[PDB]
Design a protein around this ligand. Structure first.
Ligand SMILES: *P(=O)(O)[C@H](CCCCN)NC(=O)[C@@H]1CCCN1C(=O)[C@@H](NC(=O)CCC(=O)O)C(C)C
Length: 224
């Protein structure tokens, strides 16, 4: 997270830290708990073996609130396009359910086909880097402002307003960064987006997967 602040510890109990493939440091992403046995994250964060950490603040310490569970299944959206980075969403079925408490619980998802008005303030959080030079051991967050689709539509070639969201005022040095992928975009306490991609510079506006466009796929994957 660029330009954010450290989150109050354990105030976002749905946040997940993903350790993708061995050794310990092959690749990392964020994610969020949507049910006691399912984690939603970005499809581009896919890996052969994924270790999910829940209940964390400082990921470099053995905290008693932490729960480590390996993903039993990593279900990428069937239409995920790695080239255009379209349909960048994936469900992680945990090998075992989380033991639900004040430090570990699901986030509310939006209703299907639920849009978002440009100018709306949303919060994004993660353990990604804060700059090109340094990272963070603890959870951070930042408030980003939703942009008109029209704006990303002329910056990113494969942008699709119906499945993605344009986020971030270019006039502020606030954005998600490397390692924050898969993290939630919470607008009015509901997980509306998933960190996906942007300019390498980290210069807004960036692109988030629009969660409400995938509800039927979400409900079918978790039910079945
Ligand atoms: P996530 O931690 O893996 C990362 C989050 C970037 C947040 C930027 N505000 N996403 C990420 O690296 C995605 C998936 C792989 C490709 N992504 C990149 O974003 C790349 N950028 C683009 O393709 C767009 C480049 C542009 O039009 O200038 C780079 C950053 C690797």
């Amino acid at each position: 997270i660029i330009g954010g602040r450290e989150s109050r510890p354990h105030s976002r109990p749905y946040m997940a830290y993903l350790q993708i493939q061995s050794p310990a440091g092959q690749s990392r992403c964020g994610g969020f708990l949507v049910r006691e046995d399912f984690v939603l994250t970005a499809a581009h964060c896919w890996g052969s073996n994924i270790n999910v950490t829940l209940g964390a603040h400082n990921i470099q310490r053995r905290e008693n609130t932490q729960q480590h569970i390996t993903a039993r299944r990593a279900i990428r959206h069937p239409q995920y396009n790695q080239r255009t980075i379209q349909n960048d969403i994936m469900l992680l079925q945990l090998s075992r359910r989380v033991r639900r408490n004040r430090n570990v619980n699901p986030v509310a998802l939006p209703r299907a086909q639920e849009g978002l008005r440009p100018g709306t303030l949303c919060t994004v959080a993660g353990w990604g880097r804060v700059s090109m030079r340094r990272g963070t051991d603890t959870l951070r967050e930042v408030q980003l402002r939703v942009q008109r689709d029209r704006q990303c539509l002329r910056i990113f070639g494969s942008y699709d307003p119906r499945r993605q969201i344009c986020v971030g005022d270019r006039r502020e040095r606030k954005a998600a960064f490397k390692g924050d992928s898969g993290g939630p975009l919470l607008c009015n306490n509901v997980a509306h987006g998933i960190v996906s991609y942007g300019k390498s510079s980290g210069v807004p506006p960036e692109v988030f997967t629009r969660v409400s466009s995938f509800l039927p796929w979400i409900r079918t994957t978790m039910r079945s």
